[PDB]
């Protein structure tokens, strides 16, 4: 509990909003775990200070700096910057186990039971469901694993240009091994899927614990009417939760 | 082997073409198992005779007939006709274990190793990957299970208007139980996914054992140029395999 953390990532100010909403949603649902966020120097000082309030720990990662372990890998594969920054989540050995969550996720219920899971546990990716979606995963910080991941990144890159490809390649037994490493889809519910299989969403969507705003269009790319408490024209329910947290908890926090 | 079967289903002539191509693809890849097809009286006599050549067993199911076990359920839920017909796959107790395959699937490699699997084994559905896709599944014929499925169909119907919803509801432990009941996605590769996650298809698509032509547009809805051996404007590779089998093996069979 005290050495377990939800870990997110923001490399800019737009995703910082996501991270702040995510962080707030975790607090709203009374996590007993630490909240940690990987940030980069490209995150402005005001977003950083807001992150320092919402999160227990704000970690600055500067892969553009030569002193960074991932930097050499970035020079080789400069398109892999976000991924390489994300991989620093494994560097957080002050924690024994973390749930990584993308900054464009949103928690709708307490998900501390994720810490029962082992590395690497993740929900299936829609589209290619023998890959896990790397938007939400349970992992164990380890310099060793970090180094191994960096090594694979350097050598092979990523089959999809992002962390997801690399993580699937590295944690490649996921599809065929240990059903407990399949997180229920409701722990990483693709916002695309809330219309991609409408009947299944109708059937099981009320059980959503985490919504993952895949895009294209992120929640902060919408216009939200604070009077009608709804985004302006998907079924907006989740966007509206995001915006309510953003409006209620995050914006007042930033107003300095 | 002798009492195991691939089982498909056709309720009309268009899907009969699918079934004939599927059946042919299974023979082309040298299955040691029986090939069985559920047909309805709505399947014309010429398609039926072709099916009798390709398949070891052609089973006629007429849920419109009062004598059919499913008929009462059809009267109650008449939109569930295709599903109710499909469920008769469980009535095929002359087989100890079957792989049900939709008539719009296509086999690209021998998949007899599916018979190692237990009921209910199926690949994840893209879109909502905690549901299995009912296009391809390993099951054990049983009047008992058939009756139980019919009972659930009668009582609850299907959350998606088709067999998939009902099968997921009935075989509801799939998502959380026994990784061996997750068939690799390559045993039921959604044709939608061959562009939905292009990088993953690029990475793993060459391993495709079964392509499942989800639609909208079925392989027989395309125009195929027999000179260029390609469908006229997806990546057409799989459509072209389908059409080559259709052109090479199925059409000459029907020319009576
Ligand atoms: O400019 C950026 C881009 C990404 N991120 C971080 O990296 C995560 C992933 O990027 P995101 O924009 O959320 O990507 P998605 O729209 O969720 O989709 C990508 O990321 C998913 C999970 O990481 C994969 O399933 C997809 O295939 C891939 O396209 C974000 O949530 C952030 O935490 C940033 O901080 N800044
Ligand atoms: O008029 C019909 C319709 C269906 N079938 C049979 O039933 C199967 C399922 O129908 P199909 O047209 O292939 O549906 P799909 O395009 O594959 O999609 C449906 O069926 C899938 C698996 O059964 C589910 O994953 C989807 O959610 C559902 O929309 C077919 O392959 C045939 O075997 C017929 O014989 N005649
Ligand atoms: Cl298991
Ligand atoms: Mn994301
Ligand atoms: Mn189908």
Q: What whole-number distance in Å separates Cα of residue B159 and Cα of residue A83?
A: 38
Which residues in chain B are contacts of A196 at CB distance < 8 A? 126-128
B120 and B27 in contact (C-beta within 8 Å)?
no
B148 and B170 in contact (C-beta within 8 Å)?
yes
Name the experiment that determined this structure.
Answer: X-ray
Phi and psi, residue B167, nearest 5°: -65, -40
Would you say A163 is a known binding-site residue? yes
B63 and B84 in contact (C-beta within 8 Å)?
yes
Relative orientation angle of helices A13-28 and A45-54, to the nearest 10 degrees: 10
Rg (CA), chain A: 17
- The Cβ of residue B45 has, within 10 Å, a number of other Cβ atoms equal to 8
Which string of DSSP letters, residue by residue, matches B144-202? HHHHHHHHHHHHH--TTSSHHHHHHHHTTTTTTS-GGGB--GGGSEETTHHHHTHHHHH
Which residues in chain A are contacts of B128 at CB distance < 8 A? 126, 185, 193, 196-197, 200-201, 204
Closest approach of B169 to chain A, Cα-based (Å): 10
* CB of B133 shorter than 6 A to ligand 2: yes
Which string of DSSP letters, residue by residue, matches A87-112? HGGGG-TTSSEEEEE-TTEEE-S--G
CB contact under 8 A, A124 and B124: yes
Q: What whole-number distance in Å separates Cα of residue B145 and Cα of residue B166?
A: 13
Peptide bond into B120 cis (omega under 30): yes
* CB of A163 shorter than 6 A to ligand 1: yes
Return the structure tokens found at A65: 């700096």
Which string of DSSP letters, residue by residue, matches B223-243? -EETTTTEE----THHHHHHH
Q: Which of A130, A158, A201, A214 is the best residue to mutate to test the B interface, defined by the most B CB atoms within 10 Å of its own CB?
A: A130
CB contact under 8 A, A128 and B200: yes
Annotated binding-site ranges of B for UDP-alpha-D-glucose: 9, 11-12, 15, 77, 86, 102-104, 133-134, 160, 163-164, 215, 218
Show Cβ contacts of residue A190 under 8 Å, excluding neighbours closer than 6 positions.
A125, A126, A133, A196, A212, A214
CB contact under 8 A, B199 and A125: no
**Domain range holding A180?**
1-256
Strand B97-101 to B57-60 pairing: unpaired
Which residues in chain A are contacts of B184 at CB distance < 8 A? 130, 175-176
B107 and B26 in contact (C-beta within 8 Å)?
yes
Q: What whole-number distance in Å separates Cα of residue B26 and Cα of residue B35?
A: 8
In the three-class reduction of DSSP (H, G, I as helix; E, B as strand; rest coil), residue B71 is classed as: helix
Measured in whole angstroms, the distance separating CA A45 from the mean position of its chain's CA atoms is 21
Q: How many domains does chain B have?
A: 1
Closest approach of B184 to chain A, Cα-based (Å): 7
- CATH assignment of the domain containing A10: 3.90.550.10
Q: Name residue B210's beta-bridge partners.
A: B107
């Amino acid at each position: 509990m005290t050495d377990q953390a939800f870990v997110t990532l923001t490399t800019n100010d737009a995703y910082a909003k996501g991270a702040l909403v995510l962080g707030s949603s975790l607090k709203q649902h009374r996590t007993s775990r630490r909240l940690a966020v990987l940030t980069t120097p490209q995150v402005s000082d005001t977003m950083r200070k807001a992150l320092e309030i919402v999160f227990d720990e704000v970690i600055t990662v500067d892969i553009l700096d030569s002193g960074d372990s991932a930097h050499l890998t970035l020079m080789k594969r400069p398109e892999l910057g976000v991924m390489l920054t994300k991989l620093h989540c494994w560097s957080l050995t002050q924690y024994s186990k973390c749930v990584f969550m993308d900054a464009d996720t949103l928690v709708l219920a307490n998900i501390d039971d994720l810490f029962e899971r082992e590395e690497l546990s993740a929900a299936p990716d829609p589209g290619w469901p023998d890959c896990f979606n790397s938007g939400v995963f349970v992992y164990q910080p380890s310099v060793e694993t970090y180094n191994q991941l960096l090594h694979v990144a350097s050598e092979q890159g990523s089959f999809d240009g992002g962390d997801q490809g690399l993580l699937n390649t590295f944690f490649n037994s996921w599809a065929t091994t240990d059903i407990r490493k399949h997180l229920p889809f409701i722990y990483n519910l693709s916002s695309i899927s809330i219309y991609s299989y409408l009947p299944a969403f109708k059937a099981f969507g009320a059980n959503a614990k985490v919504v993952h705003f895949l895009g294209q269009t992120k929640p902060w790319n919408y216009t939200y009417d604070t009077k009608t408490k709804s985004v302006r024209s998907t079924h907006p329910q989740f966007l509206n939760v995001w915006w309510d947290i953003f409006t209620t908890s995050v914006v007042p926090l930033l107003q300095q």
